[PDB]
Specification:
heterodimer, A: 60 residues, alpha+beta, three-stranded antiparallel beta sheet, 3 strands, 42% helix, globular, B: alpha/beta, Rossmann fold, six-stranded mixed beta sheet, 9 helices, 15 strands, nuclear protein, 3D genome organization, Chromatin, Cohesin, ATPase activity
């Protein structure tokens, strides 16, 4: 499975969108997810990480 | 005058080849607690000529990824900066670690440090004075300087204190040919000091007004000795909103903070660098004004300077157009990487 940061931010405002982005950073640090950004300012894609073998959309 | 992007290869925790940016006019660098953000601050300092001793290492080679624990990832490392300018081709400034020594390059031609620095100077970037940088705790240090310490600081930025040793030498040489000898060094020091001081004093009220968003606030800078200002304290008086006119010293708390900020921003509005790196200034801020400073940065970034802020507080960095988010990847050594996120695509 995977999750797109940009879809998660669709109906958010600036402060909510920043918090979701920040949480991608936090969740990566905890190895809950893996992260992928093809190029600068493209979508960022979250993949399951080693220290969390649940469902991905549970974190979000 | 624009820092478009930074490119790093195997510098500290930035393993491999990595692009940082492109930067917008107001960019915030953020991330959870790690070495990543401060290593990026060091990469910027390093590409702009910083000495090894200010980079938290003992030898240059120790800046190569993995080198501190004897597992270097390569025999070289580099940081480069792309500087863009309307009407002109991009100029790339790079510093490479090669054989334990620094190699400087402009557009892939090797150059000596003297030329690297001269070329940066022509762009407004004073690498020895570090005019582009607001270090951590800069607000607090300003807020503590008394009138004479404020004069010391102006002698530094204006480089008039360079002439301070000859001023005293020719003053003893005086007590007819020495009258002219002293009046010339007196005039050089004075014109250096006053050119800086009067720009800062001119700009400080508008800055103090912009920071505390209502127009009732006012701020003033006057020498104690208006003839030879370098020989006496610099007075700094504020009319904080609602309070009557007072010396900045006699202020208190979150308003002395805003007055030191205005003096700090005012000092930098003289011969300003095209970009301004603010390392965690939002740390010494309350929820009473952090939003206003962030709005002041946002406003200034559309015209006066590019703003690059390293920020811990969402009430600050949500005002950026662009976020660079720093994260760790697990490995032998700490590894950092970045993400870029456009905030302008969302309302507030």
């Amino acid at each position: 499975e995977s999750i797109s940061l940009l879809e998660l931010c669709r109906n958010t405002n600036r402060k909510q969108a920043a918090a979701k982005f920040y949480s991608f950073l936090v969740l990566k640090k905890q190895q809950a997810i893996e992260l992928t950004q093809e190029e600068p300012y493209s979508d960022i894609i979250a993949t399951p990480g080693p220290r969390f073998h649940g469902s991905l959309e549970v974190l979000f | 005058g624009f820092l478009k992007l930074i490119e790093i290869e195997n510098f500290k925790s930035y393993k491999g080849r990595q692009i940082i940016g492109p930067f917008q006019r107001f960019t915030a660098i953020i991330g959870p607690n790690g070495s990543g953000k401060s290593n990026l601050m060091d990469a910027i300092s390093f590409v702009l000529g910083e000495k090894t001793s200010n980079l938290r290492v003992k030898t240059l080679r120790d800046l190569i990824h993995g080198a501190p624990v004897g597992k270097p990832a390569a025999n070289r490392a580099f940081v480069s900066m792309v500087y863009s300018e309307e009407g002109a081709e991009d100029r790339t400034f790079a510093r490479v670690i090669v054989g334990g020594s620094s190699e400087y390059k402009i557009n892939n031609k090797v150059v000596q440090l003297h030329e690297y620095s001269e070329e940066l100077e022509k762009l407004g970037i004073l690498i020895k004075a570090r005019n582009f940088l607001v270090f951590q705790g800069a607000v607090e240090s300003i807020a503590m300087k008394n009138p004479k310490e404020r004069t010391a600081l102006f002698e530094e930025i204006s480089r008039s204190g360079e002439l301070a040793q000859e001023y005293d030498k020719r003053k003893k040489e005086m007590v007819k040919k020495a009258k002219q000898a002293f009046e010339q060094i007196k005039k050089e020091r004075f014109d250096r000091f006053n050119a800086c001081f009067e720009s800062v004093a001119t700009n400080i009220d508008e800055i103090y007004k912009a920071l505390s968003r209502n127009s009732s606030a006012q701020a003033f800078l006057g020498p104690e000795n208006p003839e030879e200002p370098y020989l006496d304290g610099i007075n700094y008086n504020c009319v904080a909103p609602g309070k009557r006119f007072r010396p900045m010293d006699n202020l208190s708390g979150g308003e002395k903070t805003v007055a030191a900020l205005a003096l700090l921003f005012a000092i930098h509005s003289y011969k300003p660098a095209p970009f301004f790196v603010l390392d965690e200034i939002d740390a010494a801020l309350d929820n009473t004004n952090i939003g206003k400073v962030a709005n002041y940065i946002k406003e200034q970034s559309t015209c006066n300077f590019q703003a690059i802020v390293i920020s811990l507080k969402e009430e600050f960095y949500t005002k950026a157009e662009s976020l660079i988010g720093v994260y760790p990847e697990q490995g032998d050594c700490v590894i950092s990487k970045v993400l870029t996120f456009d905030l302008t695509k969302y309302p507030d």
